[PDB]
Design an enzyme around this catalytic site. Structure first.
Site, short mmCIF file in Angstrom:
data_model
loop_
_atom_site.label_atom_id
_atom_site.label_comp_id
_atom_site.label_asym_id
_atom_site.label_seq_id
_atom_site.Cartn_x
_atom_site.Cartn_y
_atom_site.Cartn_z
N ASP A 2 7.30 8.87 -4.28
CA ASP A 2 7.65 8.41 -2.94
C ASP A 2 8.40 7.08 -3.00
OD1 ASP A 2 7.86 8.18 -0.21
OD2 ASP A 2 5.78 7.57 0.11
N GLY A 54 -4.48 5.12 4.20
CA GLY A 54 -5.41 4.18 3.59
C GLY A 54 -5.39 2.83 4.27
N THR A 55 -6.56 2.17 4.27
CA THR A 55 -6.72 0.88 4.93
C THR A 55 -6.42 -0.26 3.96
N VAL A 56 -5.51 -1.14 4.34
CA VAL A 56 -5.08 -2.26 3.50
C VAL A 56 -5.63 -3.55 4.10
CG1 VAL A 56 -2.88 -2.42 4.72
CG2 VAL A 56 -3.12 -3.45 2.45
#
Ligand SMILES: CCCS(=O)(=O)Nc1ccc(F)c(-n2cc(-c3cncnc3)c3nc(N(C)C4CCN(C(C)=O)CC4)ccc32)c1F
Ligand SMILES: CCCS(=O)(=O)Nc1ccc(F)c(-n2cc(-c3cncnc3)c3nc(N(C)C4CCN(C(C)=O)CC4)ccc32)c1F
Lengths: 254, 252
Positions: free
Chosen positions: A122, A16-18
């Site tokens: 996780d 995912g892009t942060v």
């Protein structure tokens, strides 16, 4: 908690892009590049529902979710780096007090999660962010392929249904994080082979040696850490007892 | 509705305040519990509605509401922050704060207030004593929780005013800016409650801007004076204030 599209301003990019954005102050928005998927939409709804019921100083502050430009989660912005980067990448000389304080805060957060029956699957020292300093914030937490159900072998059919994650995996990860805090290095530092470590941990043949712990560390902390690393799941204690023991040891050692 | 902390889970401790009595408790770590002197269903629905008002607040610069308890005593449980109130820092302790720290505290308070007003939440009791400095530079804001037909035209007019609004909050923010920049409570010379009340009500008295610190920028003082306009409509809106404060912080 749906934030309108026009309200959220996007910024610099940091699965995912942060991206660090600006919305009533500094915030961080994680969006996925998609144009999305209904399965991913249901997964996003479930993740948002899990994240909405979390209010704690030691847990990352979820602030909203946006669905119009891209399926995305907006939380607070914290200055600092991950505990993994602090201990392993920079090797910053952390006093034992700072180590036990980080341990106590992580234990508070995990006890809060488990009290709500939330399973952080996780949990690792790389997902533990140190806002400012000595302030811990935790984040980064069913055969969908319906068509290929018939052709897959019994080897792969059995693997898809498995659900190994539980509270015991979380307390084991917490014990490994305690090992990282006290020793100052990743467990199994000599074995630079993934397959060997995977096999030896699956067969229970290898456990992180508590002898490499720093001399400044007290004995009660090492005892609790070893207790959290029990190979049998049921032998591992519950997080309320862990938090009580950490608080008692901190009070004893001032 | 789903945030009630059950009884017995919260352990109470020393009282650190007495709106409501505050106590540092232990519940999955250090928390702060504010308790009310009040158990009635009519009051219980109002408490539930106040809890619903508090539930729509998630911001780093706003105090983190963590739950509400109704079994042992009606109480609100929030996070625990190490430090003191901005009132204690500036007035009681007179800590030497750099102008950068002052404008940063102002920017954080402005972020929090802009977020509150964006949620159509009206902080009625905004003052420098409700601004807590976690660590020593993280702002946390709190303490913001009919017979009409029979009333005469003389008394009906009083009900229609509704004096608390966004303008009262920006006026309080301007007073907080005055405290930040000068370093002392407004109207230090008078020190009379009734006199100050009357003179501010008739708009004859305003906090003297001559006692402002020399380090304070001109744009900051301009915004402060704009927030202290006697006419409610002349006071600016909080988004513009936040933009101006952010621009001034970036410049300096
Ligand atoms: C209570 C919600 C938990 S969550 O399970 O929903 N996970 C989640 C959701 C949304 C997020 F934005 C981030 N997230 C934020 C930063 C961050 C980094 N630096 C300063 N401020 C923030 C960051 N950094 C990364 N590297 C990776 C992910 C990051 C999340 F972890
Ligand atoms: C979150 C939703 C908003 S809310 O509308 O629901 N309101 C609310 C609800 C529940 C609360 F617990 C508090 N509240 C918490 C602390 C708190 C204290 N210490 C660490 N962390 C937090 C606190 N302190 C208070 N005082 C008296 C100050 C004054 C001066 N001081 C000096 C000279 O030293 C120190 C402290 C007053 C109230 C306090 C609430 F404001």
């Amino acid at each position: 908690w749906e934030i309108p599209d026009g309200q959220i301003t996007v910024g610099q990019r940091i699965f995912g892009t942060v991206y660090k954005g600006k919305w009533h102050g500094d915030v961080a928005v994680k969006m996925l590049n998609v144009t999305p998927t209904p399965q991913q939409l249901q997964a996003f709804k479930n993740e948002v529902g899990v994240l909405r019921k979390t209010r704690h100083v030691n847990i990352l502050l979820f602030m909203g979710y946006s669905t119009k430009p891209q399926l995305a989660i907006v939380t607070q912005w914290c200055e600092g780096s991950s505990l993994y980067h602090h201990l392993h990448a920079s090797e910053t000389k952390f006093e034992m007090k700072k180590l036990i304080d980080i341990a106590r805060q992580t234990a508070r957060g995990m006890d809060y999660l488990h009290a709500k029956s939330i399973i952080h699957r996780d949990l690792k020292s790389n997902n533990i962010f140190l806002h400012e300093d000595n302030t811990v914030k935790i984040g980064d937490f069913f055969e969908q392929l319906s068509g290929s159900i018939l052709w897959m072998a019994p080897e792969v059919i059995r693997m898809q249904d498995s659900n190994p994650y539980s509270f015991q995996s979380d307390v084991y990860a917490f014990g490994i994080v305690l090992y990282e805090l006290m020793t100052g290095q990743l467990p199994y530092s000599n074995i630079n082979n993934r397959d060997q470590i995977i096999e030896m941990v699956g067969r229970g043949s290898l456990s992180p040696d508590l002898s490499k712990v720093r001399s400044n560390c007290p004995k009660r902390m090492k005892r609790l850490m070893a207790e959290c690393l029990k190979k049998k799941r049921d032998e591992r204690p519950s997080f309320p007892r862990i938090l009580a023991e950490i608080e008692e040891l901190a009070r004893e050692l001032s």
